[PDB]
Structure 1
Amino acid sequence: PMEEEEVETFAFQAEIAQLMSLIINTFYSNKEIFLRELISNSSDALDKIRYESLTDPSKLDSGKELHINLIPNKQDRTLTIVDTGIGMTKADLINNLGTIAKSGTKAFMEALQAGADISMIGQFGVGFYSAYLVAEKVTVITKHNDDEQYAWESSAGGSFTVRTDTGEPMGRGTKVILHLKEDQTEYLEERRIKEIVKKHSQFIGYPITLFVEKE
């Protein structure tokens, strides 16, 4: 039969929309730091499940290995960062990735306007949005122990969507899929990926694996 799926469309908080617009439409050198921000979010999420699981071991039933995978796909021009962290509930997606004001947003846009390096984004509580330095669209698939699997997605322009994900089940964690802009395909090259992890993500406390599809 025909599947029915529910979708919800949300407006970004005004300054978050403003920051997304600034990141998308301004030229920045040093855009490679997007990967650092996404790995450091996976790292934080893995911290979370590791500690929760000291309190209750059954939080690892959904999978015991705590790691980060990087999956560039030169065919569909996506770079996917997968972690087996804590994941996000539905409400976690809606609140943390776009509806709720971040206290640092305004200070970051002034910094940037004054000529700060886009690298500073990590200090302002808004590093997720560095994904739009390189991606025209971002899909986040996520599964938390307390909820079903969901898909968040935005091509920016002021809105994002959240829907139950009926794609491939993940046991627990988060998958960020960057649909890369046509001039940012260097981020699918295994040497560039390696270079930037070594530079910026060198002291992350969980194993990182790079998966390269056979040329």
Structure 2
Amino acid sequence: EVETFAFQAEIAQLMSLIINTFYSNKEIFLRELISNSSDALDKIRYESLTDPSKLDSGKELHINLIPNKQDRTLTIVDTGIGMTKADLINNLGTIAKSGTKAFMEALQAGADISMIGQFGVGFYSAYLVAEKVTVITKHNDDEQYAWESSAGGSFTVRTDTGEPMGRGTKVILHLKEDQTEYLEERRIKEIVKKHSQFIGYPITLFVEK
């Protein structure tokens, strides 16, 4: 059972801008997704300070980076607070309408795409490198769901029957054919060291063989 939704017009506009603007500094997508993961981990940690049972779904607070050259995917896994179905539909838990408005005003006033995270819509930088993004998520208060979009104005939401995650979010980037550098260990390490040195959670880069 798959539900198909239209993006709000302003979010479709944001994604079109990200996909169509010539902008070479694509590597910032990883900083933005890791920052979202850190924010998610902060939220479940804060909730656990007064209610330890919030961590019954998993006590470990971490971020895993999983490249897969056979599938051409880069997956960013966190064990943060996750998102409900309602969160997924409401632009992955963002205030994306007002964030997009502020972002595009900043771009016409001299900003560049790398500042996207300052406007709370950093998730959508995934489309700098991905032709399709799948988000699997599990929040303590809801069931496990899969969101997916190849842009083009629509996204789908379905109950996920895949491997149970316990709690957290998995962002699966189906990379564009010319963006496979972001599956290479030395490239991912370089980006993490450059942009994510002060993230307060362990970031484990998985290797392949």
Please indicate, yes or no, whether the TM-score normalized by the shorter chain is above 0.5. Answer: yes
| Cα pair 1:31 1:133 within 8 Å, conserved | yes
CA deviation map 1:90-130 (0-9, x unaligned): 01111133896521212322433555321110111211100
Q: Tell whether the 8 Å contact from 1:82 to 1:176 is kept in structure 2 after alignment.
A: yes
- Alignment partners' CA distance in 2, 1:114 and 1:42: 29
How many equivalent residue pairs? 209
TM-score, normalized by length of structure 1?
0.93
1:11 and 1:99 in contact (8 A); partners too: no
Residues 99 and 121 from structure 1, CA distance in 2 versus in 1: closer, same or farther, beyond 3 angstroms? Answer: closer
User: Following TM superposition, where does structure 1 have runs of at least 4 consecutive aligned residues deviating by more than 6 angstroms?
Assistant: none
Contact (CA 8 Å) 1:13, 1:100: kept in 2 or not?
no
* 2:140 aligned residue: 145
The alignment yields a C-alpha RMSD, in angstroms, of 1.5
**For residues 178 and 32 of structure 1, what CA distance do their matches in structure 2 show?**
13
Contact 1:16 / 1:98 at 8 angstroms: preserved in 2? Answer: no
The alignment's TM-score, normalised by the length of structure 2, stands at 0.96
Residue 203 of structure 1 pairs with residue 198 of structure 2: yes
Alpha-carbon spacing, 1:110–1:100, altered in 2? closer, same or farther (3 Å)? closer
Q: Identity across aligned pairs (percent)? A: 100
Matched residue, 1:3: none
Deviations 1:167-198 (A, max 9, x none): 11101000000000001000000000000000
Which range moved further: 191-200 or 119-128?
A: 119-128
User: Which runs of no fewer than 5 residues in structure 2 stay unpaired?
Assistant: none
Q: Which sits farther off after the overlay, 182-191 or 51-60?
A: 51-60
Q: In structure 1, how many angstroms separate the alpha carbons of the residues matched to 2:104 and 2:14? A: 7
Task: Give unpaired runs (5+ residues) of structure 1.
Answer: 1-5
